């Protein structure tokens, strides 16, 4: 059970900046630590992953009239590695 | 021929506009752009875009000459308001009534 842990990448100006140091970015499910994440990439991609950081977010507020609704919640995984690379697009 | 033009939901009171129009009625046309831009008010720059729409449609839609062409009907009439509130000394509050107007010009030959 790997391909339900991590979902999709984040391509930004910071995520594009960090690929000059082989730091890549993903958007992880909740309910998951950083050790479940480390052996996930390391068995899809065969990259010999290195250390990992993580964070959370909080609801924002989309609203366009009669739709006073909140939004889902995130948990990013700024990942790092030395030996190798992965081309995503 | 009698051309016209109307401006709609213009954000000024009528009682403030109606002071300028009395200086504009029953007069020539080029004897009005002058008296308008030599009157320090805030009404004047919006009654000036509203002649020049009634003069630029007596040239392309209805084919009259601007040489002799006078002003026969100008008037302002009330509109919808916008209710607001200002707080006061004690917990009480007080009304505010921000008002609007519609403007209407008519240019005619004889």
């Amino acid at each position: 059970e790997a391909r339900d842990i991590l979902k999709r990448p984040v391509i930004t100006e910071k995520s594009s900046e960090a690929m000059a140091e082989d730091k890549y970015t993903f958007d992880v499910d909740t309910r998951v630590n950083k050790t479940q994440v480390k052996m996930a990439v390391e068995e899809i991609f065969n990259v010999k992953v290195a250390s990992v950081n993580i964070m959370n977010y909080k609801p924002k507020k989309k609203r366009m009239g009669r739709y006073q609704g909140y939004t889902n919640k995130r948990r990013k995984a700024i990942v790092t590695l030395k030996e190798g690379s992965i081309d995503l697009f | 021929m009698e051309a016209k033009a109307v401006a709609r939901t213009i954000r000024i009171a009528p009682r403030k506009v109606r002071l300028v129009l009395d200086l504009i009625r029953g007069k020539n046309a080029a004897e009005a752009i002058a008296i308008l831009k030599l009157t320090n008010k805030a009404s004047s720059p919006v009654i000036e875009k509203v002649l020049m729409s009634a003069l630029a449609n007596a040239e392309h839609n209805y084919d009259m000459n601007t040489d002799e062409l006078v002003v026969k009907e100008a008037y302002a009439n009330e509109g919808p308001t916008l209710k607001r509130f200002r707080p006061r000394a004690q917990g009480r509050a007080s009304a505010i009534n921000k008002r609007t107007s519609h403007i209407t010009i008519v240019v005619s030959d004889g």
Binding site: - | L19, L23, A34, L38, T39
Partner: protein
Amino acid sequence: AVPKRRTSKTRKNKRRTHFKISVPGMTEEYKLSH
């Protein structure tokens, strides 16, 4: 210190006889920019 009555439609309008504005001068349109 408080109005005892209502102000009619006439007495409101008999009063504004002088509550108008005035016209600029007229030099040849040119301004009177002395």
